[PDB]
């Protein structure tokens, strides 16, 4: 992460760590959520904390909080990277990747494929039978 990002996350952490002791407990997470107009149960708060408490000591320190934010940012970036790739493959912007578009963009990526090979790729990913690859069909492949 950048210095900047670490700084914004340190500010956020400080808002949860009400007593300033360096860790966020389930009670402090309760106090933050109620201050936002929410009202979780104690079981729900233990469950939310469990997902972020990497070492299992029951509370969340700043390295664990930063690890949660870094993984959230990476998930958002991977999703954006796959969307951007789809928009680059869909050269005419109609929302579908055709066999001709896929053959052409693979050459830009350094792969010279035959029309039969690209047509096999289209049929493997084309789960609705329209002969083109739509965005969700593309995501399915890039996630497998
Ligand atoms: Ca604390
Ligand atoms: Ca911990
Ligand atoms: Ca297209
Ligand atoms: Ca399709």
Swiss-Prot record:
Transmembrane segments: none annotated. Interacts with MYO10, the interaction is calcium-dependent and essential for MYO10 function in filopodial extension. Expressed in normal mammary, prostate, cervical, and epidermal tissues. It is greatly reduced or undetectable in transformed cells. PANTHER family: CALMODULIN LIKE 3 (PTHR23048:SF0), MYOSIN LIGHT CHAIN 1, 3 (PTHR23048). It comes from Homo sapiens. Ca(2+) 4 binds at residues 126, 128, 130, 132, 137. The lineage of its organism: Eukaryota, Metazoa, Chordata, Craniata, Vertebrata. Ca(2+) 3 binds at residues 90, 92, 94, 101. Pfam families: EF-hand_7. Belongs to the calmodulin family. Ca(2+) 1 binds at residues 17, 19, 21, 23, 28. Gene3D superfamilies: EF-hand. InterPro entries: CALM/Myosin/TropC-like, EF-hand-dom_pair, EF_Hand_1_Ca_BS, EF_hand_dom. GO terms for molecular function: calcium ion binding. Induction: By TGFB1. Keywords: Calcium, Metal-binding, Repeat. Binds four calcium ions. The gene is CALML3. GO terms for cellular component: centrosome; cytoplasm; extracellular exosome; myelin sheath. This is Calmodulin-like protein 3. May function as a specific light chain of unconventional myosin-10 (MYO10), also enhances MYO10 translation, possibly by acting as a chaperone for the emerging MYO10 heavy chain protein. May compete with calmodulin by binding, with different affinities, to cellular substrates. Residues 4-39, 40-75, 77-112, 113-144 form the EF-hand domain. The keyword Calcium applies.
């Amino acid at each position: 992460l950048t210095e900047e990002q670490v700084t914004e996350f340190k500010e956020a952490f400080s808002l949860f760590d009400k007593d300033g002791d360096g860790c966020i407990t389930t009670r402090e997470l309760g106090t933050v959520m109620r201050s936002l107009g929410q009202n979780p149960t104690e079981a729900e708060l233990r469950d939310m904390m469990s997902e972020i408490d990497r070492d299992g000591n029951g509370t969340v320190d700043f390295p664990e909080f930063l690890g949660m934010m870094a993984r959230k940012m990476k998930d958002t970036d991977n999703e954006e990277e796959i969307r951007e790739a789809f928009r680059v493959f869909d050269k005419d912007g109609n929302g579908f990747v055709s066999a001709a578009e896929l053959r052409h963009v693979m050459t830009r990526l350094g792969e010279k494929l035959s029309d039969e090979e690209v047509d096999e790729m289209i049929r493997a990913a084309d789960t609705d039978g329209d002969g083109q690859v739509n965005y969700e069909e593309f995501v399915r492949v890039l996630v497998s």
